[PDB]
Design a binder for this molecule. Structure first.
Ligand SMILES: c1ccc(-c2nc(N3CCOCC3)c3sccc3n2)cc1
Ligand SMILES: c1ccc(-c2nc(N3CCOCC3)c3sccc3n2)cc1
Lengths: 233, 253, 244, 239
């Protein structure tokens, strides 16, 4: 269950789910690189890791940019080591297209190192439900369908190398779309969730921590729903 | 006499032990996956009741628990029988306490309808029986173990897929039903797992099998058991209605 | 030899006295089948026979209880003796406000009955080396969570049952498919307050309830020779309203 | 009842196999059919096929990868035949090329779909029917590609249906299994045999069996079917 001796990269680590993931992997003993798109977000990450006794760094990374990805990886490899645990946490058509093209960019870049080690964990984090109505449902379901299929396919491609590829599909998690809702809306929402509560960011992080472990070595191509029983597609 | 209840026998605090003596019931614990689950829940600090259909199986479980330092028992239980389920649960409650982790791994094997029907009816019988105690505790974990791929050809594929589809829908529906009580209900769907059957395959046939699996190897029973352990934990509290495939990337439907 | 035509075929449609089942019986009739529609009561069987007559469809209304081995055997014997072997079988005979604990008994009963009838009519199809089995799913039965739990469980059960049976019987050129309705224009829909009807229509992309005839047209197509390579499929007929 | 009289249909990749069969089936039902190919010679062959089957319409050159080709083709059709309100999108493998294949194909579906949606939105009626890939390519890479494309098509179809449904436009997909085409007909015998053994019906499907499903989906009887992917695979499900 422990990750001592491993380097983990967590994209979008400055708040909410990404931050929780960074802290959890740190708690399990990994060296953690968390990333944000701004210098201010990188500084927040570095302060957070320091405050929690986690070794690593806060770096600026734009996953939409081949240049930013190549430059950031080379920097990590020179100063911390090769990341063997990569957690991807950084209208419906353009959103899905952009997001899967980013996942593909980052995954390809980190796979060289994983192939050298003959070991790896790629864990892709889905989007939380972003909005209540029909457009929200369309977007949530399309993004999740894309993520599920992308994950299954990359897992096939890299499996002979003892690299697993999985996803975590969060439902309604306690974050700002939810934290800003009128009470009538929050109540209606909670009524669709069998557990009758929103998820905590730490509850997504614990699942990620398990997927990253040696105990999950035979889990690949999977999408683990973390949604308190609320299934939408 | 045949004796049907066998105890383990029972100041080192292992870091892994987080389930703080919660009682776990693992059906079909005498070998393979079920045995691995029973051991993993013991490593995690549960009191483990493992079951088999015979007194000899129940004794073998108790010896396994003993040899591994796990507190608990090997008991006879037939999940196909209302009488056996009722009587056995009452016995557990009187002697060891209310099972709040229940792992359904017992299950029987043109066959497809009667197999799936029998199996889902058993899952429902046992699950409904343990729910009072979980409801009273306002906490529970029900974990359902799917069937491994049992045979290579078309009848095998039909069975495997029909069982898996039944288990996935069942799990989701029972999760919906019992969620307001902070009971989770999840499934684990194994792929090809290294057992006595698969070790004895001719090399040409093992090779063809491994070719269908991205990881290029059979799964270990312990690799199923670790997933079960996680799902039993407080960290999986928001995971419910889920079926977790543990198959090395080999997805058959 | 014509696309879509069911001339020369005998179709059994269970639960044919109203709504979706009646629409199916009339659609298969329009396509040229001899149609045996069934109900659980003599009254329902008479209504079917009158409906068929009124529409110029040859066939009969019979009393059938799919829960009973004796009823199933008797009904098949009657049909074989007087009309011939049914080679198209359409299953539409599913069994305090609805709660989320009802899904198990309902699904268990409905799949058991479906298996019973399907196994019985397979002998005749196996002999003919041709068949169509078409299973109709249950519409959404209530608004809210219990409604969704129950609808989803039934649909999941029917999808898996359909796919498995198709696999079992495919080598005999018998196809087995399902049609999974969404919200169809029926009484639970009528009883809703207008604000509730509006909210319901807002979960459906097409913005309307489906008609029984829209289910029936899918069934007619599946029954046809043109659908001979479609097997093990569940066709959703739900106006874009997907819930599982 | 099944009639498409008065409707214009555009069928991409109509010069052979499944696309050709679709063109002919929509024509049998009474549609005016515009079938496309990537070359002038393919477009002329389409036109001769239509004539030989008594179907009104035309062959045209279309490159679904090109915004310019798509815009120019639609402007041509609108000027000479009318607005297509039925559109059928029909136009070794490597272990790490599945992403670029799916990405390209979906980007092309989206490009053509968005272009024909204007006319359908104006009419408040339409049918978009997307045809998936045929099973057959060799090895694990073939399986990876097939499965990824299928998952992409299913989700794409469901999402676009949600987006356009309020306009009485339906959007559905057909997912073929192992179909008798020019591309499967001469696969190595061991591969054909292995695939046949995975198919309950025990035979390859015919292109016409795909076309009949498309014909049904284009009909008014399918007006409540949207966002669906209909598998047409003889019971052989590959995921
Ligand atoms: C082949 C054969 C049988 C089944 C099946 N599925 C069920 N369910 C419960 C609802 O969720 C889906 C599965 C249930 S519930 C009681 C019986 C039952 N049977 C499925 C495939
Ligand atoms: C493997 C590889 C790629 C995909 C995939 N899925 C997509 N979808 C899925 C359907 O939801 C719309 C977006 C989309 S949309 C733009 C690109 C794209 N790619 C799926 C499996």
């Amino acid at each position: 269950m422990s990750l001592q001796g491993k380097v983990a990269l967590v994209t979008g680590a400055s708040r909410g789910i990404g931050q929780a993931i960074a802290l959890e992997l740190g708690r399990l003993g990994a060296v953690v690189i968390g990333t944000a798109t701004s210098a201010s977000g990188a500084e927040k990450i570095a302060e957070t890791l320091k405050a929690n006794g986690v070794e690593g760094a806060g770096l600026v990374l734009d996953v939409s940019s081949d240049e930013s990805v190549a430059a950031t990886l080379e920097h990590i490899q020179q100063h911390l080591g090769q990341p063997l645990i990569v957690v991807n946490n950084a209208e419906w058509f353009d959103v899905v297209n952009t997001n899967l093209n980013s996942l593909y960019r980052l995954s390809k870049a980190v796979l060289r190192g994983m192939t050298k080690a003959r070991w790896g964990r790629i864990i892709n984090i889905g989007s939380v439900v972003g909005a209540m109505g029909n457009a929200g449902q369309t977007n949530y379901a399309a993004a999740k369908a894309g993520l599920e299929g992308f994950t299954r396919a990359l897992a096939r491609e890299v499996g002979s190398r003892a690299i697993t590829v999985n996803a975590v599909a969060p439902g309604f998690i306690d974050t700002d779309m939810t934290r800003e809702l009128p009470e009538a809306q929050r109540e209606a929402l909670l009524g669709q969730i069998p557990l009758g509560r929103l998820g905590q960011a730490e509850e997504i992080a614990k699942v990620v921590g398990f997927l990253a472990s040696d105990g999950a070595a035979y889990v690949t191509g999977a999408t683990v729903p973390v949604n308190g029983g609320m299934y939408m597609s």
